[PDB]
Amino acid sequence: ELRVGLEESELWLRFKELTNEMIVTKNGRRMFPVLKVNVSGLDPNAMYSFLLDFVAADNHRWKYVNGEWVPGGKPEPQAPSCVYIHPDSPNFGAHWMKAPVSFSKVKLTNKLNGGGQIMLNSLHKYEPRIHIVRVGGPQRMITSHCFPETQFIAVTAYQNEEITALKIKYN
Numbered sequence: 001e002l003r004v005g006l007e008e009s010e011l012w013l014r015f016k017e018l019t020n021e022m023i024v025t026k027n028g029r030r031m032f033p034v035l036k037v038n039v040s041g042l043d044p045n046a047m048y049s050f051l052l053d054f055v056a057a058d059n060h061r062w063k064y065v066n067g068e069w070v071p072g073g074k075p076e077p078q079a080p081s082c083v084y085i086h087p088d089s090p091n092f093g094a095h096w097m098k099a100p101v102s103f104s105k106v107k108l109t110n111k112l113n114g115g116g117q118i119m120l121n122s123l124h125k126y127e128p129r130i131h132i133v134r135v136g137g138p139q140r141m142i143t144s145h146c147f148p149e150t151q152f153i154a155v156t157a158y159q160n161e162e163i164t165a166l167k168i169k170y171n
């Protein structure tokens, strides 16, 4: 049984208890914290690609009203985000299991852009998700895993200064 764990869940939970926010820019902004995943139970000799996408956790637009995030009343369906390929992909199971898989180079944007960057909708709430894709072998296989601890709202600037302070304290 293939096992997926969040590295530094301690710290993600402090962000989650405040409602986490991630900046999006036209050119794209790297994440803090960085999603880092512990993986065991891969075939060390099998080939795999690690993919990252962002599920829209609800269908609403959120707004920071009198020190509190509150959802809009007008849900619209949210099309899936594009997928980010971990740049170590494709690689042997041994490679992925020798250290936490760190998505340090993904950039979050608000604008449809050349390559790499993932476009999110500002003021929507997102739940990061990975796919582990067994490649090159005969039988293709996908294992997916969500990380509720890593939920955030996409923002063009921070609203809750408690988030601002935590971001700086721990970076």
Ligand SMILES: O=C(c1c(F)cccc1F)N1CCCC1
Pocket: 049, 051, 085, 089, 090, 133, 135
């Ligand atoms: O063949 C690829 C791929 C890659 F793994 C790295 C660069 C470009 C690619 F199309 N993948 C299999 C499904 C998910 C990623």
